[PDB]
Amino acid sequence: MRYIVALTGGIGSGKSTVANAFADLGINVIDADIIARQVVEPGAPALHAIADHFGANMIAADGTLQRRALRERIFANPEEKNWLNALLHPLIQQETQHQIQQATSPYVLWVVPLLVENSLYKKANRVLVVDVSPETQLKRTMQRDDVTREHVEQILAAQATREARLAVADDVIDNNGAPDAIASDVARLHAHYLQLASQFVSQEKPE
């Protein structure tokens, strides 16, 4: 049984930067997006039901998914998008706990961009939020993606607010100024998490 520390943050908060810092400390990272990408890769059951629902030509000859192609027709008929979820959802769910169970580190870092939006913090033991100013969010996204300021702002208005994230955070790490000052905080958090991880299974009283 692994202690699950969930990580989340808005677009451009540098989630990857924080996750890698924990990775360097020996923690296994389970990214929610990679999980989502794997359940629809060659061999996966999800490919099948896709061909049965949307169509046979949904899956290329080499068995791989026409990922960027499917993403089109779905947003062309967004009412099926909900369907394409009841299918992948339980699978994502299964793969995620399968990889939590496979981790050997004292605790795992579960990076969930939509932690707040999908209330996935209800499945975490600890919630770490990487926090930055909305300004920084705009800045970094206007460079790493080459988009207008009103394009990112349009995204921000679609994700949970900064405050909504802080409302469910157990720990918060500041990341709006050089991916190096992070070292200090991660080390602190990491030390505490090991502490929590080693005691949670047999702890008689909360905290």
UniProtKB/Swiss-Prot annotation:
It is found in: Cytoplasm. Signal peptide: none annotated. Keywords: ATP-binding, Coenzyme A biosynthesis, Cytoplasm, Kinase, Nucleotide-binding, Transferase. Pfam families: CoaE. The keyword Ribonucleoprotein does not apply. PROSITE patterns: DPCK. Coiled coil: none annotated. Its main location: cytoplasm. Pathway: Cofactor biosynthesis; coenzyme A biosynthesis; CoA from (R)-pantothenate: step 5/5. Gene3D superfamilies: P-loop containing nucleotide triphosphate hydrolases (3.40.50.300). It comes from the Bacteria. GO terms for cellular component: cytoplasm. Monomer. Forms homotrimers in the presence of sulfate. The trimeric form exists in solution in equilibrium with the monomeric form. This is Dephospho-CoA kinase. It comes from Escherichia coli (strain K12). The lineage of its organism: Bacteria, Pseudomonadati, Pseudomonadota, Gammaproteobacteria, Enterobacterales.
